[PDB]
């Protein structure tokens, strides 16, 4: 009865496509035509965080918009004071193959993970004043590519075993397992209300999950290669993805389909990171071509370039107050742009 | 200027000194290597001595030294069959050890395809490969037995002739020499089709009781680093 089920799935897909086409009343490019252009976004490197002696794979800003944590293949997890360039902490890592790092919204914890298939939680605030592994979250059967904190006790992680997970930090077990992706999940972004989150996998699909129920609410398919980055719009009703096809695409949750495409024939290098500004008007994407592009989320016309990295840009983050953008790269430096 | 600012600066200076010392200690005579291959290949048994496990479930690390020079060899074990993503984490290793089961003609084309993707990968273009054509004893047994014909899997073997530069073993059969050098050339044609000059392939015929693999890796890493230095100093 495989043929009958396949036909049922095909007609369901046809119905979904017809519904999306019916809901496709207009286009974002058409509606935003009258919008005044942003202009020329000139961002200059304000500070350069030196101290990493190897390729840099991830970073995450703090909720206070001043402290940020970075990860590298040298085995160090440095918490930086972006205001004064001072290194607040330097956490050695057991495994040098970490691919992600997170900073807890409360600021008391820092997480990291990589090819060890383990998310390690580090207690920044200790009575003895030192940093050490609080707990190690095990259970993923593939490399862990992204982890984001909901609070001091709950963390959502994505892994290369095609599954996202929600963890109970105190208990140390997976409260919820999210399944449905058919490829390695590369990146996960949380909603402003932390009730929903989206993930980008290596099947050119982005899925909306429900944190409490653990079900895939919606699926978005508009990419032609693996998605490497994802980020909710500040409103929380949309998100943007960056894929290996050298293209950013902005999807709407309520409209259930893609809105606008950010690509050009000049760019052929894949995208490694995306992020929005505080207003959501500017979409910043990091590419493999050694620099970044400051897109326009509405007009879809490139409005700036963040050049000044001597290798592939692996990570990119914007402060919660929008004051600064920190981009890390394989040349072992972080640059704060403003 | 403030007391808190001075204390923070002193802490930062101590941190920076600690990282500088750690980096100098870690980068001194230590070369990282990635062991790749299939399950049938004796990748776990390439380097015999110093199989010092440091497994974290995901990666089995082996450390060994030849002549006062330390080598770290990683074996990514606990991952899905898809590898186009986590292979980019190994784009700065000095060399890649590729292990091939020579006697297995069924999966030899799969091994060749894997070798060509690594070779032509964007992030692995500058990394040399130390190709270890394992199970030469079994390959010789297969050639002497003659039950399985390598021409069925590679039709161009009929028109193949043993290279002049071959160095056969004294007790080796000409058919075995032709077969092993045929496999070696199949790999080397792929290597030379797109090698850009920044990386090379170093093939070696090994068995299950070979104890010279560590020395071979030492010598090929020395050659790789010497060629890199010559290229950097515009001497090559």
């Amino acid at each position, epitope marked *: 009865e495989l043929d009958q089920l396949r036909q049922e799935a095909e007609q369901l897909k046809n119905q979904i496509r017809d519904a999306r086409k019916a809901c496709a009343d207009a286009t974002l490019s058409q509606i935003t035509n009258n919008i005044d252009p942003v202009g020329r976004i000139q961002m200059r490197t304000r500070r350069t965080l030196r101290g990493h002696l190897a390729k840099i794979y991830a970073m995450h800003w703090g909720t206070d918009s001043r402290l940020l944590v970075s990860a590298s293949q040298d085995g160090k997890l440095i918490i930086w004071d972006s205001y004064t360039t001072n290194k607040v902490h330097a956490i050695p890592l057991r495994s040098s193959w970490v691919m992600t790092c997170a900073y807890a919204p409360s600021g008391n914890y820092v997480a990291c993970g990589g090819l060890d298939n383990i998310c390690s939680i580090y207690n920044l605030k200790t009575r003895e004043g030192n940093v050490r592994v609080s707990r190690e979250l095990a259970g993923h059967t593939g490399y862990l590519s992204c982890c984001r904190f909901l609070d001091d006790n709950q963390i959502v992680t994505s892994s290369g075993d095609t599954t996202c997970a929600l963890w109970d930090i105190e208990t140390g077990q997976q409260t919820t397992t999210f399944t449905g992706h058919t490829g390695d999940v590369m990146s996960l972004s949380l909603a402003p209300d932390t009730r929903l989150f989206v993930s980008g996998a290596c099947d050119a699909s982005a899925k909306l999950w429900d944190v409490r129920e653990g079900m895939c609410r919606q699926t978005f*398919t508009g990419h032609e*290669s693996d998605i490497n980055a994802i980020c909710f719009f500040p409103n929380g009703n949309a998100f943007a993805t960056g894929s290996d*096809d050298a293209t950013c695409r902005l999807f709407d949750l309520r409209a259930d389909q893609e809105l606008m495409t950010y690509s050009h024939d000049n760019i052929i290098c*894949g995208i490694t990171s995306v992020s929005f500004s505080k207003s959501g008007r500017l979409l910043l994407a990091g590419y493999d071509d050694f620099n970044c592009n400051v897109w326009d989320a509405l007009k879809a016309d490139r409005a700036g370039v963040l050049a000044g990295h001597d290798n592939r840009v692996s990570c990119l983050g914007v402060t919660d107050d929008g004051m600064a953008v920190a981009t890390g790269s394989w040349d072992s430096f972080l640059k704060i742009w403003n | 200027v403030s007391a808190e600012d001075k204390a923070a600066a002193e802490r930062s200076k101590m941190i920076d000194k600690n990282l500088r010392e750690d980096g100098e200690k870690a980068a001194a005579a230590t070369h990282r290597l990635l062991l790749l291959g299939a399950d049938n290949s004796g990748k776990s048994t390439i380097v015999k001595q110093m199989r010092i496990y440091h497994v974290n479930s995901g990666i089995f690390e082996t450390k060994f030294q030849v002549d006062k020079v330390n080598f770290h060899m990683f074996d990514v074990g606990a991952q899905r069959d898809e*590898r186009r993503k986590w292979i980019q984490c190994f784009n700065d290793v000095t060399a890649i050890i590729f292990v091939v089961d020579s006697s297995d003609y069924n999966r030899l084309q799969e091994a060749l395809n894997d070798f060509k993707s690594i070779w032509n*990968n964007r992030w692995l273009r500058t990394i040399s490969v130390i190709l270890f054509l394992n199970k030469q004893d079994l390959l010789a047994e297969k050639v002497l037995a003659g039950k399985s014909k390598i021409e069925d899997y590679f039709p161009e073997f009929a028109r193949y002739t043993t290279p002049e530069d071959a160095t056969p073993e004294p007790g080796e059969d000409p058919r075995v020499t032709r077969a092993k050098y045929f496999i070696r050339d199949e790999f080397l044609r792929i290597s030379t089709a797109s090698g850009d000059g920044r990386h090379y392939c170093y093939p070696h015929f090994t068995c299950s009781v070979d104890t010279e693999n560590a020395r071979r890796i030492f010598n090929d890493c020395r050659d790789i680093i010497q060629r890199m230095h010559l290229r950097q100093y515009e001497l090559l």
Partner: nanobody
Amino acid sequence: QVQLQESGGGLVQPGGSLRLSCAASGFTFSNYKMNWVRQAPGKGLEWVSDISQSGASISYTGSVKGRFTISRDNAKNTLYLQMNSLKPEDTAVYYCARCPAPFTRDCFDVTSTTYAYRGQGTQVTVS
């Protein structure tokens, strides 16, 4: 949505011929190298042939070299495989597959168990 719907296949006598097709949609066909993969019963997936973006660089597996001929039609976004002079060892489900990334000569995960950018498959049997 990226999908690769195939066609062709069916019963054929030994020494017969078949022409498999691949309707590619959802992506720029001219940008990606394309492959042909088959899975014999009781065996894993085996790469058969591939063709570059332009169509100049073409390679085949040794067991099918000379007989099979892959051709791509970038205008119509279709991939073909002229399967003439068939043998009973060629009975397999033939999947079309494309390399994960554009503008690349490397194709890591094509014969994977759960590859995403591959077709549903075409049942080819020889009797």
